[PDB]
Design a protein around this ligand. Structure first.
Ligand SMILES: Nc1nc2[nH]c(CCCc3csc(C(=O)N[C@@H](CCC(=O)O)C(=O)O)c3)cc2c(=O)[nH]1
Ligand SMILES: NCC(=O)N[C@@H]1O[C@H](COP(=O)([O-])[O-])[C@@H](O)[C@H]1O
Length: 200
């Protein structure tokens, strides 16, 4: 299966996916990396791995639909089967999500359904949980609400900050995102017609 990875920043999840998808038994190959932001470290990681990159600046578009259409054009150019959102921070439009239904995965740094949104660690710390984690899910129109594929719990230590908690949770993200991508790319897991996850 042919994979696009979308990023907005550092690209540690991208690197873990590069490493995993290059193992001999990988059912996935990363054929394009798309960033909506120029000059981020994830682009450097892609270039070092010899993977083509595109920068599609969302600020140059009138609305989400036009921006998403520009992404979609590149996905078609590279005959992409599966899209991974890996630190990509844009909310996607309904029609784009529907087109890629069952074919687009996101990593989120909480145990969904807790702490949806852009600042999950801030929320986890404010709430005072002692267990947080990360989630890979299929992308549905409602943000951070699509069907869950894998999760991993991560402890919160007393005195944690966003810096220390996010570091600990990323170790788990780098485990479950590659595992989830392999499950979907191999056809082991799919989004069922009834809208629920199906393990073949
Ligand atoms: N339809 C849909 N889109 C999605 N995008 C992402 C991946 C991102 C999930 C995400 C969580 S909060 C947020 C957000 O507020 N984005 C802002 C930009 C904020 C910033 O620049 O930091 C926006 O897009 O206006 C983005 C996941 C996902 C999803 O499940 N459904
Ligand atoms: N709303 C999505 C979200 O918060 N994503 C989170 O952004 C970070 C990106 O790190 P990376 O660029 O090093 O992969 C990761 O922690 C990811 O789960």
């Amino acid at each position: 299966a042919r994979v696009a990875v979308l990023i907005s920043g550092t690209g540690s999840n991208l690197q873990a996916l590069i490493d995993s998808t290059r193992e001999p038994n990988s059912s996935a190959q990363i054929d394009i990396v798309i960033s909506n932001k120029a000059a981020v470290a994830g682009l450097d990681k892609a270039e070092r791995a010899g993977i083509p990159t595109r920068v599609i600046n969302h600020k140059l578009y009138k609305n989400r639909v036009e921006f998403d259409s520009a992404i979609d054009l590149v996905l078609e150019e590279f005959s992409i089967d599966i899209v991974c959102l890996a630190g990509f921070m844009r909310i996607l439009s309904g029609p784009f999500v529907q087109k890629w239904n069952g074919k687009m995965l996101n990593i989120h740094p909480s145990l969904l359904p807790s702490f949806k949104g852009s600042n999950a660690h801030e929320q986890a710390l404010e709430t005072g949980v002692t267990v947080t984690g990360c989630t890979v899910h299929f992308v549905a129109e409602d943000v951070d609400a699509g069907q869950i594929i894998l999760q991993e719990a991560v402890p919160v230590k007393r005195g944690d900050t966003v810096a220390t908690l996010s570091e600990r949770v990323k170790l788990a993200e780098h485990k479950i995102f590659p595992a989830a991508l392999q499950l979907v790319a191999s056809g082991t897991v799919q989004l069922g017609e009834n809208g629920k996850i199906c393990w073949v």
